[PDB]
Design a protein around this nucleic acid. Structure first.
Ligand SMILES: [K+]
Ligand SMILES: [K+]
Ligand SMILES: [K+]
Ligand SMILES: [K+]
Ligand SMILES: [K+]
Ligand SMILES: [K+]
Ligand SMILES: [K+]
Ligand SMILES: [K+]
Ligand SMILES: [K+]
Ligand SMILES: [K+]
Ligand SMILES: [K+]
Ligand SMILES: [Mg+2]
Ligand SMILES: [Mg+2]
Length: 1335
RNA sequence: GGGAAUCCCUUCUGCAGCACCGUUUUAGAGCUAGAAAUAGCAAGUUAAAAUAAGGCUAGUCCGUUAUCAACUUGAAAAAGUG
DNA sequence: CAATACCTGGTGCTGTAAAAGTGATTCC
DNA sequence: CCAGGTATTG
């Protein structure tokens, strides 16, 4: 008995099928367990497992980190209250107690209900004097009087609890506050560098212009307009643009060779400026640094909108300015509405349901919704011009706690906190003693490289302590080992050397590593001249001279420099042919030039005695990112460099690690030669062996020592191994389910292993609109275009492909240097850069928007050479703006290098057929290592089971060429059918061409391969089309003579298999996990559905949650008290155990159920019912458990194959010859009556199992309404109709314009007397429990 | 076919640190005419506390990912059953 | 108890290594 | 999104 298995691995399904020698699917009698009449059942060995998507860890992590931040914020407040404890007890022994219970109702409060002062007169007086906390904050900063300790605490606590971001290092307001003074100093520096061309900045109000609430470009234009004879693209204009945050290009300003775009926000600016300063001189550095200072001032003026010389609390002053203008404008608006529109006053100022001022303050209306609601009202009335200006500036009737307050740095809150402490420490000695303590409470951050401050009970922590004691913000440096913690943070993420698994890899920017990379590449360079007989390698002396003369003097070494600066200058060659490198060398000594600029001692870098020191420096600059820790580690070399050099070394940092260790590169030595790997790379006679040759040479000891160095740790389990793979967790869930399906199928076949296992993995193509808008915004900003000014776009609109391409191309044609019209996109074309006939790629990375695809050139290749000559520079602009990627740019410019060759097209077709994805190889490896476990006489693996991997295109083309069409919406059988067709096609393919095993089975001329792989699947066809020819009906193997395909009997077999109505569709039952309930904190309500947010917070007084998630239902057979007499009555019902209740219920099910009300619980009759638990009722009607009180549809509609194929062809689902198109069209019109037959089949099914009378009546009326509609559109909407009958949760669907709402099964009473069905993973093994025999 | 280093890119995964809102109950004395529903007006911007119930291991830690038919034997781990 | 219509926490930033999709140089 | 919970109206 021989058989094969076909598998279709998906993100929500695993289709499976068993086939025999004749491509038939067996059928078996399987035993049925339980308490029903049926002892066994007939099963076809084909089916599909269904399961909810496996989720990533991201949402769990985000909630975990947020939980920590809430705990630590509370701890900050606890620290501050602990500092205030004694003196506050002297002042008010219950102040902190009243704060703690502020949330409680007056009934539940143990102290007076007014928090601050404990009586109503003082509380009202306080609010009258300080209507916002910012009034109190500014008063405490400015005043010299002794203040109430409670108000001091409230100000300090408010600053500490909401302390602001930490994006800026160091201290703030260092005379970089004034915009006028820094603009004047920028003019001073510019006029100093350009005496002949000075700027008259007199009368220019730099403060109001630059700090205006306007866009960056508008303010740039406004300032430049105040400077006659200066243009915005000039040098001073570009400096102002850099200060405003734009991306100016200083290339044209200095007649520079290539671009020097500068952005003060980019990570590369520190280098991007120095690089520019290397070309035009270091006397322009003062100018760019003055512009940077101006940028800091403008950023601060965005937040502080008040003069900083009248108060030391400019933030609180700005909030008070918000409050005062809110008050003034509200009084004016009330008066205006009273006078002009008196009927609208109640709706605006009293209706919380409306988005007026009432909904803005009391309702759920946001500032944006309030502005949208009141803008037409202000436009309708008179005297609203200033209010309208404030509205369109987003600065009308503002609150103080708003969404944009994220701009506020923590240094500003710190400045006010420090000022209050300086004020009040003169009266309270404990404030003087604890001033720095409180400041540390606000400023302290747990470093990202330290992680949770755990003590052996967090699987996420890595921190190590210097002493065993509680960590506080004040003892962190003493208790926490920051060096070891940060080193562990990196070393727990980095790989070891795979050749020497106990050795750490080098820093990627290490000098030794870059030497290795350069010599490895350079050792395979060859050159020829005239008198030479053949190309020769470079000798050790030649490579040493090239390194010293070229690589150590240029950051990049081009081939031109190699031919001219070495072969001409040294070897006196006028002509030389180079191989092994193209255009320029890939490897380079970048760190060497970085350190050469920093330390300015070439002899220090070239001295080998300093190698260790330099390696350690680069390690310190790579291993750490905190500048203080870098300085602490570079301390040990302070004697070797000037303090200026030490500071410049501090500022330099690197990221990333190499893939080889120092011991491998320059440590281990060959036994007989005594030379390291790097020694052989520098000089290896005339062989010039590279790294791969060195470690694989049997005449050297490198290979032997690498073999000896290998180890193998603890073997992962199957689940662990699958989890460690690289890929989406969703596909990993399918992979593990696939392995369990294979194990059960093998057990079904009597532990006999299959001949083949054919796997096919679905292409994984699956907020995102936010990423699209971020790309377009940054690309347009880098580009300097005003396309977003002229054409504003909502992020959602970018989901349209043509509009997204339009913005990515800056509103221009990609093939013609013309503007596109945004209202003409329907008339334009989306073109594939490489044609879809070669590369089936429909992503934005292979698509462009053009007026007409004809303008690309010839359709058989890439864009023509003419188009590339026209558009290459515009493409490079788009590439630098990241509006197109590097691969997209290279595919566009491919015509420069010869376009598509015949080898490229052959490779494209091979890629379309042969699967090369790494995750699919890992799945094949897993199955192969589980099936094949024995070795032969030569100690080589015996491959009893061939693991074949196919791409989806093979079976897809097989279905479309032999009319085995699929329609996904009909049912779930197509997953199983795909697995079957995979097994058939895969086995037949390797039977016909056994030499293909290397390509398709796991384990160890261009026109010819193009033709061969284009016609690889022709052996299935009988007639193949000026090349029309026939094939035998019987296809056999050429050498063995074995039959592989009988075109007269095997197609009928495939058709019979797809026609079988019994297919084992199994929905994976799963306990529900995750959030306890909806997160919405609802208002109080007289409902038992509300859930307390805290133990003592009665939701009838405080509100809370509702809508909890049922982890799993439980069948309870017991008795409950009834009536006022509490008489016991027998019941059988479903109790949903929520996620929150699960732990308590499982700890003691009997006591849990008795608490719920049940008495005398039959403990052994408790049935655990997870979601999707399957029940069968009458006439084969099945239901699945959706929760404790709702059901899902549990049946599949096995629509016959003739109707499925008719629906495919009639609906134009997905062509071929026009004669074949005519035959299919004639078939559709000759079988038009299939529409009524399909509707009748849906009706019989629905009346038998769906039981939705109203929806079925609406559907029948809708079908009988649109019978004069075209056949194609009727078929397309019949496709929609199957939502009524689909397995699973009910959903709404549209038939033409008629909308059918979902009929829900809002009761689980009937399943309590039905038959519960427990299914194995394949559904072949069943246990059926008659629940009517319970109770 | 499988694999390695480098160059130019892109994406996915995992982890850590942090900010701004939102919501919720309470506090911010509403007034006048009414015996009452109600009418006329005044007012509104702020704060406290919670932000999974909670847990023991008591840490400035942990609490939403992964994994799960049934039955037999087991505390579980598991294996076994057609 | 059924049927109907509403509801559903969100945004921004910093740091990090790794596999893997794809183009290229050199090799096992 | 999807699809289970909830109150309102029957
Ligand atoms: K889930
Ligand atoms: K009380
Ligand atoms: K001007
Ligand atoms: K609101
Ligand atoms: K190159
Ligand atoms: K670093
Ligand atoms: K020194
Ligand atoms: K789960
Ligand atoms: K109130
Ligand atoms: K199951
Ligand atoms: K990341
Ligand atoms: Mg908590
Ligand atoms: Mg808030």
């Amino acid at each position: 008995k021989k058989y094969s298995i076909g598998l279709a691995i998906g993100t929500n399904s695993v289709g499976w099928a068993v086939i025999t020698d004749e491509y038939k699917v067996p059928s078996k009698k399987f035993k049925v367990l339980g308490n029903t009449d049926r002892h066994s059942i007939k099963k076809n060995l084909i089916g599909a497992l269904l399961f909810d998507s496996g989720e990533t860890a991201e949402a769990t992590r985000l909630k975990r980190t947020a939980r920590r931040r809430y705990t630590r914020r509370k701890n900050r407040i606890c620290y501050l209250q602990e500092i205030f404890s004694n003196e506050m007890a002297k002042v008010d022994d219950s102040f902190f107690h009243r704060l703690e219970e502020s949330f409680l109702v007056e009934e539940d409060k143990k102290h007076e209900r007014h928090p601050i002062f404990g009586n109503i007169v003082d509380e009202v007086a306080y609010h009258e004097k300080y209507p916002t906390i910012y009034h109190l904050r500014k008063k405490l900063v400015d005043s010299t009087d002794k203040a109430d300790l409670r108000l001091i605490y409230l100000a300090l606590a408010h600053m500490i609890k909401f302390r602001g971001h930490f994006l800026i290092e160091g201290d703030l307001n260092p005379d970089n506050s004034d915009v006028d003074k820094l603009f004047i100093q920028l003019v001073q520096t510019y006029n100093q560098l350009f005496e002949e061309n000075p700027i008259n900045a007199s009368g220019v109000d730099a403060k109001a212009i630059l700090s205006a609430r306007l866009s960056k470009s508008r303010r740039l234009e406004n300032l430049i307009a105040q400077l006659p004879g200066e243009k915005k693209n000039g040098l001073f204009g570009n400096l102002i643009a850099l200060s405003l945050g734009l991306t100016p290009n200083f290339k044209s300003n200095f007649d520079l060779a290539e671009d020097a775009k500068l952005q003060l926000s980019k990570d590369t600016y520190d280098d991007d400026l120095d690089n520019l300063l290397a070309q035009i001189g270091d006397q322009y550095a003062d100018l760019f640094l003055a512009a940077k200072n101006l940028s800091d001032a403008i950023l601060l003026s965005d937040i502080l909108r008040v003069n900083t010389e009248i108060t030391k609390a400019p933030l609180s002053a700005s909030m008070i300015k918000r409050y005062d203008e809110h008050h003034q404008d509200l009084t004016l608006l009330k008066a205006l509405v009273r006078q002009q529109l008196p009927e609208k006053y109640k709706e605006i100022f009293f209706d919380q349901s409306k988005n007026g001022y009432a909904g803005y303050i009391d309702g759920g209306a946001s500032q944006e919704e309030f502005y949208k609601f009141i803008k037409p009202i202000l436009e309708k009335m008179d005297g609203t011009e200033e209010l309208l200006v404030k509205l369109n500036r987003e600065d009308l009737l503002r609150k103080q706690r708003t969404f944009d307050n994220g701009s506020i740095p923590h240094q500003i809150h710190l400045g006010e906190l420090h000022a209050i402490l300086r004020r009040q420490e003169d009266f309270y000695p404990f404030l003087k003693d604890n001033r720095e303590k409180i400041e540390k409470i606000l400023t302290f951050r747990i470093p990202y490289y330290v992680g949770p401050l755990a003590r052996g009970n967090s699987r996420f922590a890595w921190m190590t302590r210097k002493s065993e004691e509680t960590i506080t913000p004040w003892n962190f440096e003493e208790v926490v080992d920051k060096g070891a913690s940060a080193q562990s943070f990196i070393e727990r993420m980095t790989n070891f050397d795979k050749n020497l698994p106990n050795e750490k890899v080098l820093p990627k920017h290490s000098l030794l590593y870059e030497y290795f990379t350069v010599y490895n590449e350079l050792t395979k360079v060859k050159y020829v001249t005239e008198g030479m007989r053949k190309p020769a390698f470079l000798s050790g002396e030649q490579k040493k001279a090239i390194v010293d003369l070229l690589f150590k003097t240029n950051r990049k070494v081009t081939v031109k420099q190699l031919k001219e600066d070495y072969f001409k200058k040294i070897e006196c060659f006028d002509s030389v042919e180079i191989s092994g490198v193209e255009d320029r060398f890939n490897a380079s000594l970048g760190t060497y030039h970085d350190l050469l600029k920093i330390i300015k001692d070439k002899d220090f870098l070239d001295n080998e005695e300093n190698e260790d020191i330099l390696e350690d420096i680069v390690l310190t600059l790579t291993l750490f990112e905190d500048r203080e820790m870098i300085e602490e580690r570079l301390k040990t070399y302070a004697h070797l460099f000037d303090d200026k050099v030490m500071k410049q070394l501090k500022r330099r940092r690197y990221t990333g690690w190499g893939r080889l260790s120092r011991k491998l590169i320059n440590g281990i030595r060959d036994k007989q030669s005594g030379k390291t790997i790097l020694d052989f790379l520098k000089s290896d006679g005339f062989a010039n062996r590279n790294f791969m040759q060195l470690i694989h040479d049997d005449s050297l000891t490198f290979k032997e020592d690498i073999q000896k160095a290998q180890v193998s740790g603890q073997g992962d389990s199957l689940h662990e191994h699958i989890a460690n793979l690289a890929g989406s967790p969703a596909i990993k869930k399918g992979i593990l389910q696939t392995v369990k399906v294979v194990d059960e199928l093998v057990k079904v076949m009597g532990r006999h292993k299959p001949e083949n296992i054919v796997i096919e993995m679905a292409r994984e193509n699956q907020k995102n609109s936010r990423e699209r808008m971020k790309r377009i915004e940054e690309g347009i900003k880098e580009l300097g275009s005003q396309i977003l000014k002229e054409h504003p776009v909502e992020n959602t609109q970018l989901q349209n492909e043509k509009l997204y391409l339009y913005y990515l191309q800056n509103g221009r044609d990609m093939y013609v240097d013309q503007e596109l019209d945004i209202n003409r996109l329907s008339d334009y074309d989306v073109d594939a850069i490489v044609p879809q006939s070669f590369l089936k790629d429909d992503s934005i990375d292979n698509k462009v928007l053009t007026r007409s695809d004809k303008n690309r050139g010839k359709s058989d290749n890439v864009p023509s050479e003419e188009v590339v000559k026209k558009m290459k520079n515009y493409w490079r602009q788009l590439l630098n703006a990241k509006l197109i990627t590097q691969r997209k740019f290279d595919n566009l410019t491919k015509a420069e290098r010869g376009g598509l060759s015949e080898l490229d097209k052959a490779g494209f077709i091979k890629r379309q057929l042969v699967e090369t994805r790494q995750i699919t190889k890992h799945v094949a490896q897993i199955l192969d290592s589980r099936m094949n476990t024995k070795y032969d006489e030569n100690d080589k693996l015996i491959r009893e089971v061939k693991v074949i991997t196919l791409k989806s295109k093979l079976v897809s083309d097989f279905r479309k060429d032999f009319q085995f069409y699929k329609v996904r919406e009909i049912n779930n059988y197509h997953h199983a059918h795909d697995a079957y067709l995979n097994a058939v096609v895969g086995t037949a393919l390797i039977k016909k061409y056994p030499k293909l095993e290397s390509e398709f089975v796991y384990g160890d001329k261009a026109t010819a391969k193009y033709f061969f792989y284009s016609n690889i699947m022709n052996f299935f066809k009988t007639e193949i089309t000026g090349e029309i020819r026939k094939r035998p009906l019987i296809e056999t193997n050429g050498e063995t003579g074995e039959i592989v395909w009988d075109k007269g009997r095997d197609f009928a077999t495939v058709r019979k298999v797809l026609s079988m109505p019994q297919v084992n569709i199994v929905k994976k039952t799963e306990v529900q996990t995750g959030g306890f309930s909806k997160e919405s904190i609802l208002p109080k309500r007289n409902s038992d559905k509300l859930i307390a947010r805290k133990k003592d917070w009665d939701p009838k007084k405080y509100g809370g949650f509702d809508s909890p998630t049922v982890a799993y239902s439980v069948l309870v057979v017991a008795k409950v008290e009834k009536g006022k007499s509490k008489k016991l009555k027998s019941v059988k019902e479903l109790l949903g155990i929520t996620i929150m209740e699960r732990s308590s219920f499982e700890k003691n099910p009997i006591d849990f159920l008795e608490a719920k009300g049940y008495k005398e619980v039959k403990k052994d009759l408790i049935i655990k019912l997870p979601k999707y638990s399957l029940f069968e009722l009458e006439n084969g009607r099945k239901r699945m458990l959706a929760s404790a009180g709702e059901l899902q549809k549990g049946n599949e509609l096995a629509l016959p194959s003739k109707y499925v194929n008719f629906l495919y062809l009639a609906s134009h689902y997905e062509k071929g010859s026009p004669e074949d198109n005519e035959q299919k069209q004639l078939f559709v019109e000759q079988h038009k009556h299939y529409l009524d037959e399909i509707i009748e089949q849906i009706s019989e099914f629905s009346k038998r199992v769906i039981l939705a009378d109203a929806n079925l009546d609406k559907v029948l009326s809708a079908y009988n309404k649109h019978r004069d509609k075209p056949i194609r559109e009727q078929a397309e909407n019949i496709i929609h109709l199957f939502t009524l009958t689909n397995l699973g949760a009910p959903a709404a669907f549209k038939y033409f314009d008629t909308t059918i709402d979902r009929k829900r099964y809002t009761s689980t009473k009937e399943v309590l007397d039905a038959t519960l069905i427990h299914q194995s993973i394949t559904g072949l093994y069943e246990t059926r429990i008659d629940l009517s025999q319970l109770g």
